[PDB]
C-alpha cells in the first residue's frame, strides 16, 4: 500500500539488471570466456576493442561503433523494461467488517494474486533480459572478431585466442585502417604471400 | 623479429556485482543496475 508518485511494488528481494558484460578478473556465441579467455582491464574506454602490437608500440583501443551500438541497445532495453511495467497493479486499502470476511478474503486474494503476477513478470523479465544481455555482449565480441577476420582474410594468421598475427608489416595507420573497417586487401597481399612462403 | 599482432578482447574491471539468469545464478558482471529500492 502506497500513496503518491511511487515505484511499483514487487515481492522480490533482489532485482538487478545486467548492463555491462561478464567480468573476467583473471555463452551462446562462444567469444566471451570462449576462445577469448578473459577480459582486458587496461581497456577502459570501451566495452569491446583492440590491442594492437607492432614495432611502433603496443596499446589498447576501443571499437567505439560497436560499443555505442551496444550501449544504445542496453539503454533502450532498460527504457523498454521500465516502460512495459509502468502499468503495474497498484494495491489500495479496502476494509470490511466481520460479516464480510468472504469479500475481504476475495479482495485479499485478488490483490495478492496481482502482486504475485507482477512479481513473476518482473523477475522473469530480469532473468530473460539478463540472458539476452550477456548473449548480446558475446555476440558483439564474436561479430567484432568476425569483422576483423573477414577484413584481413589470409593476410593474417588467426592464433585461436582472439588474436591475428599479420603476414605483413602493419603499422599504426594499417592498424587504424583495421579498426575503422577500411583495411585494404590488395596493398598487402603480395608481401603476405611472400612471408607465407618464407615461413612455410 | 616480432610480427605485428592485433587482438579482439573486451572490457573487464574489479567489479563484484552479481546478476541472476535462468541457467546461471549469481553471475559476476562488469556493470550492473539495481532496479529495486530496498531502503
Amino acid at each position, epitope marked *: 500500500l502506497t500513496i503518491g508518485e511511487c515505484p511499483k511494488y514487487v515481492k522480490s528481494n533482489k532485482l538487478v539488471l545486467a*548492463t*555491462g558484460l561478464r567480468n573476467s578478473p583473471l555463452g551462446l556465441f562462444g567469444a566471451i570466456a570462449g576462445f577469448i579467455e578473459g577480459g582486458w582491464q587496461g581497456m*577502459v*574506454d*570501451g*566495452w569491446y576493442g583492440y590491442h594492437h602490437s607492432n614495432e611502433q608500440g603496443s596499446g589498447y583501443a*576501443a571499437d*567505439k561503433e560497436s*560499443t*555505442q551500438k551496444a*550501449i*544504445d541497445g*542496453v*539503454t533502450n532495453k*532498460v*527504457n523498454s523494461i*521500465i516502460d512495459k511495467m509502468n502499468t503495474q497493479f497498484e494495491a489500495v486499502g479496502r476494509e470490511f467488517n466481520n460479516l464480510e470476511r468472504r469479500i475481504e478474503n476475495l479482495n485479499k486474494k485478488m490483490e495478492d494474486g496481482f502482486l504475485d503476477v507482477w512479481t513473476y513478470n518482473a523477475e522473469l523479465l530480469v532473468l530473460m533480459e539478463n540472458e539476452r544481455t550477456l548473449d548480446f555482449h558475446d555476440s558483439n565480441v564474436k561479430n567484432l572478431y568476425d569483422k576483423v577476420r573477414l577484413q584481413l582474410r589470409d593476410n593474417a594468421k588467426e592464433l585461436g585466442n582472439g588474436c591475428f598475427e599479420f603476414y605483413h608489416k602493419c603499422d599504426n595507420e594499417c592498424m587504424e585502417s583495421v579498426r575503422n573497417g577500411t583495411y585494404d586487401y590488395p596493398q598487402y597481399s603480395e608481401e603476405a604471400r611472400l612471408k607465407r612462403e618464407e615461413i612455410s | 623479429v616480432k610480427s605485428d599482432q592485433i587482438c579482439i578482447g573486451y572490457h573487464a574491471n574489479n567489479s563484484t556485482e552479481q546478476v541472476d539468469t535462468i541457467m546461471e545464478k549469481n553471475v559476476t558482471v*562488469t*556493470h550492473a*543496475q539495481d532496479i529495486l529500492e530496498k531502503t
Partner: antibody
Amino acid sequence: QVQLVQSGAEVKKPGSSVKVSCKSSGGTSNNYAISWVRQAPGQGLDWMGGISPIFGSTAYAQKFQGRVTISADIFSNTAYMELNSLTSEDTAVYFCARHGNYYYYSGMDVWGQGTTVTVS
Amino acid sequence: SALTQPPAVSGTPGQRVTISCSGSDSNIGRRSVNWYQQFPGTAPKLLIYSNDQRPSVVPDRFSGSKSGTSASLAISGLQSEDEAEYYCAAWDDSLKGAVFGGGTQLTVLG
C-alpha cells in the same frame, strides 16, 4: 532534440558543499557521456569530470579528485555534480555538457545553460 | 592549462584569421582536438571536432587542422558575429582527463 536543463544559481558559505543537477529533457542521455565543465570569472574552461552511466564510467579530474562527486540517475535522466569543501577559488560558472558518444573524447555538442556558484 | 593559445587575435571583416593551439605529445599528438566558441555570458558551442570535422549548424567558414602536437583553427571571411572566446580542447592521456586551452578572445576591428 535534447536540451540539458540545470539547477538554479547557488549562494554558499566557505566550508559547505553544493550539488548541481543536469536534467536531460526532450530525450534520454544515458547512452552519452555528460561532462561537468566550470569557468572561473576571467579565466578559461576547466574540466571537472563526467559520468557515462550505462557504460559505467565515472571520471574525475586529477585536480578535482577526492573533492567532487559526480553521479547519474538513469531513470530521471539526470546527472548530478556534488562539490565539497567550498573555498573562494571554487567561485565559477558550472556547465553540464553532453558528449558526442559514450565517452569523453568526442566534442561536447549539447551544453547546459550554466549554474553560477558564488562562495563568500 | 596544458594547451597554449594566444590570448587575443584581431582582424577586419572579410579577413582570414587563424587561432593556434599548442599542446604536447599526450594530448594533441595522440587524441583529437575539439574547438569551442563561447560568447560572453552564454554556454560554449561545438565548432570543430575530430580536428577537421564540422557540425551541420556551424557555417563552412570555420575549419580546423592538426599537425603534430599543435592545432589550428581558421576563420576565413570574418564577420561581426564571430567576436567570441575560442577554446581548444582534447583528452590528455597523462592527466587521464580533458584539458582546455587558455582561451582566445577574437576582436572584430572597425
